[PDB]
Amino acid sequence: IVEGSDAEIGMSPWQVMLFRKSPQELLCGASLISDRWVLTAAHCLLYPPWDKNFTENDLLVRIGKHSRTRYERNIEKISMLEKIYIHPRYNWRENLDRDIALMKLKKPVAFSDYIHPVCLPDRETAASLLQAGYKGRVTGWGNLKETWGQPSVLQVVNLPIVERPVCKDSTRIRITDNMFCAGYKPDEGKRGDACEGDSGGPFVMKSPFNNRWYQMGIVSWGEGCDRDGKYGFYTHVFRLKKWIQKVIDQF
Amino acid sequence: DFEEIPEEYLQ
Amino acid sequence: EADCGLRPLFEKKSLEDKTERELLESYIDGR
Ligand SMILES: NCc1ccc(Cl)cc1CNC(=O)[C@@H]1CCCN1C(=O)[C@H](N)CC1CCCCC1
Ligand code: NA
Numbered sequence: 144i145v146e147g148s149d150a151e152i153g154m155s156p157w158q159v160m161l162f163r164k165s166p167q168e169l170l171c172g173a174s175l176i177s178d179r180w181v182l183t184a185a186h187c188l189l190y191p192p193w194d195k196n197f198t199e200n201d202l203l204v205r206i207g208k209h210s211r212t213r214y215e216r217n218i219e220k221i222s223m224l225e226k227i228y229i230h231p232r233y234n235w236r237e238n239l240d241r242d243i244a245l246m247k248l249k250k251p252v253a254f255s256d257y258i259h260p261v262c263l264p265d266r267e268t269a270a271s272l273l274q275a276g277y278k279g280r281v282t283g284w285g286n287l288k289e290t291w292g293q294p295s296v297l298q299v300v301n302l303p304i305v306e307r308p309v310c311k312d313s314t315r316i317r318i319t320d321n322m323f324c325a326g327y328k329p330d331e332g333k334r335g336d337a338c339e340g341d342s343g344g345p346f347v348m349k350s351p352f353n354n355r356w357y358q359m360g361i362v363s364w365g366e367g368c369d370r371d372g373k374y375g376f377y378t379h380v381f382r383l384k385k386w387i388q389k390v391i392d393q394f
Numbered sequence: 395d396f397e398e399i400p401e402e403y404l405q
Numbered sequence: 406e407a408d409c410g411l412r413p414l415f416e417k418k419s420l421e422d423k424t425e426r427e428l429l430e431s432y433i434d435g436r
């Protein structure tokens with residue numbers, strides 16, 4: 144996260160770290176959506192241009208964390224993966240369209256003060272909140288700068304959703320309805336973005352109607368990090384919710 | 395860089 | 406979960422985090 148701040152304890156209790164077993168390293172962010180299901184970006188698991196194609200036994204999830212590198216004894220919980228599900232129309236060849244994946248845990252995780260699921264939006268909450276200018280929150284343990292370094296604890300940044308024409312005009316990549324973009328414009332002064340290692344983490348909004356947190360996006364892609372005139376692009380969770388529900392219902 | 399995690403999670 | 410999106414150390418205790426108001430102030434519809 145570029146130009147963010149240290150998270151408060153328990154501020155993002157749905158935060159998940161995707162952790163490679165060997166070598167032991169951070170792979171991505173993710174989010175807890177129930178006691179058995181974790182949501183992430185497909186490119187965290189499958190990205191052939193970078194020779195990335197993980198199987199379940201390559202990975203662990205670490206839930207309840209705050210420190211990036213510490214083993215947070217009596218606080219974090221580490222879970223093994225039963226199965227990965229990647230969207231069948233995930234487009235890793237062109238533009239990361241449908242950049243979404245689910246991971247089912249081998250065993251349910253116990254909720255605590257530090258471990259708790261985020262809601263997924265329904266159609267009405269998405270329509271109400273996914274509007275240009277409305278701010279969401281991105282969290283992660285990724286890089287603090289595009290070029291460097293890395294944070295001691297989970298980082299947080301609040302960013303406004305951007306008008307679709309501005310998103311389109313900021314890039315040569317073909318944008319789709321399964322993406323939205325967020326970030327400040329050069330003229331707005333404030334800044335901030337996700338960066339490498341924040342992939343797969345959540346873009347959340349707090350509904351002013353029922354005071355619950357909803358995951359509206361998944362950290363997906365950006366040209367650099369926090370560059371003037373660029374924006375971060377996020378998987379549109381509601382647009383892909385029918386797939387989410389089909390997977391969870393079936394498996 | 396990362397603190398070792400209990401071996402039970404790697405088995 | 407029927408309890409989704411309500412944080413134990415914040416919403417459950419009626420405590421606010423240091424920047425959630427910035428989000429609320431940006432939600433300029435329905436108010
Ligand atoms: N830049 C870090 C970053 C910044 C913001 C956000 Cl939201 C996510 C992220 C993290 N996300 C990534 O690194 C992803 C992983 C794969 C490449 N990538 C990028 O973002 C490529 N630069 C552009 C792709 C190239 C592929 C076509 C779509 C465009
Ligand atoms: Na364009």
Ligand code: NA
Pocket residue numbers: 326327336369370371372373374375
């Ligand atoms: Na920018």
